[model samples]
Target chain A: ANLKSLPVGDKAPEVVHMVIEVPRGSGNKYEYDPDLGAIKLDRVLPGAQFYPGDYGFIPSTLAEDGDPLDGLVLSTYPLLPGVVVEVRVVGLLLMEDEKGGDAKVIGVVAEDQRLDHIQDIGDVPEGVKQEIQHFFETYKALEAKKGKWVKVTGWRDRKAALEEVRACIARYKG
Target chain B: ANLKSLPVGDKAPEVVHMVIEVPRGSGNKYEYDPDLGAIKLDRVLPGAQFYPGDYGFIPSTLAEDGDPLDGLVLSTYPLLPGVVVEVRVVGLLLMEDEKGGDAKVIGVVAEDQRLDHIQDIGDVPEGVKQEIQHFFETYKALEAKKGKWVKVTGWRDRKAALEEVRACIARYKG
Candidate 1:
């Protein structure tokens, strides 16, 4: 049988790498396979797509509609380590709540990493662990502060302060 | 032993209602006792800090002879989801082979989720997956085309095009 006819794990499909079944009543299904870097919409329903940048996915409780999708479930491409980037929040990400409430959160991108289980600490070398401990020990001494709500500072200046903190540690010796 | 002093669980300690651990060689080795919302540093080496923000206990690269460090590994914070924004790439984030890669891919965010083990497909809900599928489908389609590479026209009519795209499926159905 051709690869397209086989189920996943047995043989990868040709036309569709994976067949994602979106729930019914959502008014839309089928999407381009993000893994293979191709746009293949085999059978798609016609409807508005709600995404982070798009306003349709905006949750609204007060906008005529009583309830709307308030939660977002993010799915990353397979085999692709999550791409992380650092950013400063210019505004809030708002969504309509089910009960017609305006849900918003200040979004900021400081740092991100691909979700990889390749290293679970146990997989790391013993020497690496020891060095990591040393680094943390030094870090604790300098960042000992007590408070829940702390001030947000500039990353540029903070980067400088980090260098100074490191310099202070070097002078401390072993 | 007092509950406040005890680590959250067998594998790791619980702080601030979130499970966490201090990665080895990290810049922080402090414990934030959530019961009282207090932070305390421990095993602090001479020059390190237990400050806020995402930090790592290990190095992104091997250390040089007294090499300060490169990259960071730190505990994950619940309130702060790793986000990346305002990307202006002055350099390439690729291997040496791809030098002078002027082609840019900005406005990207990376993240990790702890849900991967699922043997039964039935256990996965459809609507939950649909929302994610719809979002990526639209993004992937737009990404495939570089129509937005050059400004077709100024900001005068950008909104019109956007509105058209937003109601694309609607227009198609009509």
Candidate 2:
């Protein structure tokens, strides 16, 4: 069965399929097959910090980076890569790299009772929020010497994140 | 003789007092002898990431947080705490935690012949720059549970940083 056939329609209120790439606490970088059928290991982030949460991207959406829109699952456990987990995006971290604005859609696994109370970026615990921000800011430390870099411009509310997701779905249809 | 006798008048091109608190790559936290005669260990950051560089502060300068302005010396080796080093201020990391604007004044040991070329933040390697930033952002992670945290609002140039040092000297004298 091809995952490409899975349509990411107007479910932009919150829930969307976040194709897990790098799971929480993962020291290794992982990614989807892109052909919608396989998982692959990227490179080792040598002497680098671990991911703060489940890292991945949404299906069928195109970001300004010319890649699928990035998504983060703020849950208690490390969900396996290649798993299509449901996420209700709470906010957007307006991040920009050398290419362009590559924001992260911050979401939560609503099924996690401990995180069900989170409805927006402001609702998440400060520590958890800082961890994500810190991860994105420094994960590229090893790559900085290679001229690869990123910066978190600021943050936006869930409404902006929803609109961001909706905007990308249309681009994917192309 | 009191440590308060140390004058900090117009000696503000860069070289100023940086009483080392936490040594580079250290697991323990150290502080100055408040009465100008002793050094003390405050607390241990169990499971916390180590300091990115020589962490310390400028004497007699009071910051918005009601503490001596914070400083970070970007040198190669780990200098012992309670050891004062002469550093030329280069730039500023505009950070704010729960208290107020707790900015970090970045400097390099001018006496270190290897780092003499670093006249500003731009001159510092990007990898090293981000290391300092990441350290400040997440070092307080454990305290995040207790409502303590920080955000790097932005960065200011060396000129602004020099002005900052001078401003604090006045505050300390006032």
Candidate 3:
């Protein structure tokens, strides 16, 4: 029951538990399995591009989509599936997927020595912005399947990101 | 032999193991004890400020100062002692201490949703930069202690940070 019952920890915007279900440069899609207490492969990336960064979700917070709030990690390193990290909210990416509006919170690994200087998203580079945009735009594009593209709508700084996180926390029934 | 033989993981610059010796907001100093297989408190911080962020070291790499490579976590959530996180190198803080040149690597939690959009230190904000600078500046200036201050020389992005990590890895005898 690790996935369903994992403690979110005491902190919110300042501190929260993040579970990495998919690491960067991975072609396979993975999801956390409560029964197995691990991550299971969901599917393969239809496109040639691998996940640009670490992909995971905030524990104990449910979003409008009725799932744990999703997140994208932009670390210089690729992490393994099921690696939980304590992090701080720095930004959010607002996008429109096939299921309607979707948002992914952005954060840094608090204990990661490489990213310690980062406090928010503005500290990121323009090239990275484009990279993320492209990743979301084409991440689900499969030549074999039919669907609309996931649109990268906008981005916000740490303040807005924290607000969204709080909203999800409030919405979380569990 | 946790301290001497803690697994560094397969990834190098992109992924590495970080051992937290001091949690953020903590007044006590701790270190990993090989004999005890746990972290042991070294002393209490005489300074008024609680550690602004989690403090730890990179396993398997030894810096020029004859210690494990030191790191500072930027998580809004403080981490606990003996917790190990898989992180990526994002930046480095160059400093001149009484003992000579010292450097601390900065990183983000790969699974932290709040900081997932960050790739390097430049993505950080001015306020954060100032906060980190202040923490390092006064981190060692205890009311009961010495006259010398820890001077922060400069900050570097992930590339330079990884280079330093690699160098320390080369210097590591273990």
Listing every candidate in turn, what is its Cα RMSD in Å to the true structure after a full C-alpha superposition?
A: 29.2, 10.1, 12.9
Cα RMSD for predicted model 3? 12.9
Model 2, B1-174: lDDT tens digits are 333335543456468877788887676887776675766787765332467778888777887667878888877788997777788888998988877766789888767998989998889777677666766676676677679888878777799998888888878878
Query: What ranges in model 3 sit over 4 Å off?
Result: A1-174, B143-148
- Interface RMSD for candidate number 3? 8.2
Cα deviation in Å at residue A121, candidate 2? 0.9
Q: Write one digit per residue (lDDT tens) for candidate 3, span B1-174.
A: 476457666788677889888887788888888778877888887767777678899988888888888988867368888888887778989999878899899887776765676678876655567778988888787732665668899999999999988888878854
Best by lDDT: 3
**What digit string (tens of lDDT, one per residue) describes model 1 on residues A95-165?**
22223324321112222233232122243335733442342233222223321122222122223322322
| Residue-wise C-alpha lDDT for candidate 3, range A69-161, written one tens digit per residue | 998876755888887888777888999987799989888777666567667888655556677788888877773266556888999999998
| lDDT scores in order | 0.23, 0.76, 0.80
DockQ of 2: 0.05
In candidate 2, residue A158 scores what lDDT? 91
Docking level for model 3: incorrect
**What TM-score against the true chain A does chain A of each candidate get?**
0.19, 0.91, 0.91
True contacts kept of 1: 0.00
Give the CAPRI rating of model 1: incorrect
Clashing residue pairs in candidate 2 (N, C-alpha, C atoms within 3 angstroms): B33-B38
Where is model 2 more than 4 Å wrong at Cα?
A1-5, B1-174
